[PDB]
Design a binder for this molecule. Structure first.
Ligand code: HEM
Ligand code: HEM
Ligand code: HEM
Ligand code: HEM
Ligand SMILES: [Zn+2]
Ligand SMILES: [Zn+2]
Ligand SMILES: [Zn+2]
Ligand SMILES: [Zn+2]
Lengths: 106, 106, 106, 106
């Protein structure tokens, strides 16, 4: 899918985690977010279209998706192990990674 | 994009890194390995076909691909930084993770 | 050695990184922050003096220092590899981890 | 707190994990290993005494302790989650990190 379709998946599933009742709901939404981050990684965003593929800006853009996937790995351990409130708080902290990339490149 | 094809991609690229001429060749092989691990994670392997998706065996099988992806993230920092011999030594340490999964599930 | 002294070291070194001109200055400040977080990990804060060491609250308090030290490991690769602006932006993103612990336990 | 004393602590606690009966014994041993690896990071090993503290070899030596502590972080999630057999298998995989540093620098 294209970059804007993957951003709608990340935004919709963050809202599902905030309102979730149980572990199965939080694990399914975190899994869908990790798949959307892995697919977004191959895109070139509109503000970087004139840059080279190997530019420092394109390295920094791709790096943000590696960081988001490592944060989701840790939150999945909490959601699978009777720490669902701690996993919901971890998902709130993902917003710092979303906002950093938007401020530079959106 | 079946499990056997993803395994071929992992094995061929590990060999490219061992014999590489420069940093560009190491970075391109490590990136192909990470794409194949993200694709392999969705498979149910032949020996676990009779188990639940929520079984402790299927959680441990999926977990090995998350561990491989985090090891590749660190090796990519070394390869991009003028630390090419260090990145080739890190790629040889991935074999620990490959062998642990094979002894249990292949 | 006390928790308040370690917190002053973390805050002072964030300010040094924001004002830095070169890689050596950023790497030195990040290293001092990692040593202060590793010393704070064994402390008990005033609001948790009544709790078991194996309570969920004490597990979550110690977890925040494990997360902070992993974020400093990633920023140190950027600082060593000449990516000074990218290491400064990573240090600004640490504030998310500081703010989350303080809202729960300060 | 010398390098040889920290190494004895790492070796004794690794052996505890292999034949442990319960989660509490595996959590206590992993925590003792993380504190010994953090204290070892400040030492200069006899074979690197004539190198600069900023040499590529001293950066690689320090990096091995950062890698070991990230591996202990993930194994502590499994030991706290009722996944004691999975934590014992993760501890077997630490051996690849111990053996890679010894082959270079011991
Ligand atoms: C969970 C974290 C994230 C959330 C919730 C999120 C959410 C969104 C939303 C709702 C949009 C607007 C889509 C529209 O036009 O309707 C968007 C766009 C965008 N995002 Fe994110 N995002 C996240 C992380 C990231 C990261 C980590 C990066 C970069 C590493 C990033 C880069 C972008 C860019 C470049 C656009 C603009 C796409 C365009 O205009 O074609 N986002 N995001
Ligand atoms: C870089 C590390 C790895 C390398 C080089 C590697 C290599 C291989 C090779 C060459 C095959 C034989 C494929 C064939 O039938 O032609 C294989 C099969 C397999 N591997 Fe891996 N592997 C790696 C990591 C893993 C990991 C981490 C897991 C589990 C988390 C895993 C699970 C399997 C399974 C289940 C099969 C058997 C598939 C079948 O019989 O259909 N592998 N791998
Ligand atoms: C780089 C991130 C951090 C910065 C800049 C920072 C800064 C500070 C500052 C300036 C204080 C006030 C010290 C005083 O009253 O004298 C403080 C207190 C405190 N911090 Fe942090 N902090 C950070 C991370 C954390 C983390 C990750 C945790 C928990 C995991 C934490 C737990 C606390 C607690 C519990 C206090 C209250 C101490 C007391 O009242 O005795 N801090 N911090
Ligand atoms: C859990 C992993 C590890 C175990 C079980 C382990 C165990 C040991 C043991 C039993 C010794 C013998 C000490 C003596 O002769 O008195 C030793 C020495 C040594 N180890 Fe480790 N070790 C581990 C990880 C590491 C790592 C990661 C590094 C480097 C990053 C390292 C570097 C050394 C060096 C340099 C010596 C020689 C010290 C001397 O001769 O003064 N070790 N280790
Ligand atoms: Zn964690
Ligand atoms: Zn590293
Ligand atoms: Zn990174
Ligand atoms: Zn894990």
């Amino acid at each position: 899918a294209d970059l804007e379709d993957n951003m709608e998946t990340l935004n919709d599933n963050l809202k599902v985690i905030e309102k979730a009742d149980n572990a199965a709901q939080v694990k399914d939404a975190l899994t869908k977010m990790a798949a959307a981050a892995a697919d977004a990684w191959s895109a070139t965003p509109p503000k970087l279209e004139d840059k080279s593929p190997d530019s420092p800006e394109m390295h920094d853009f791709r790096h943000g998706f590696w960081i988001l996937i490592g944060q989701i790995h840790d939150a999945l351990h909490l959601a699978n192990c009777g720490k669902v409130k701690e996993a919901q708080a971890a998902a709130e902290q993902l917003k710092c990674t979303c906002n950093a990339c938007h401020q530079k490149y959106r």
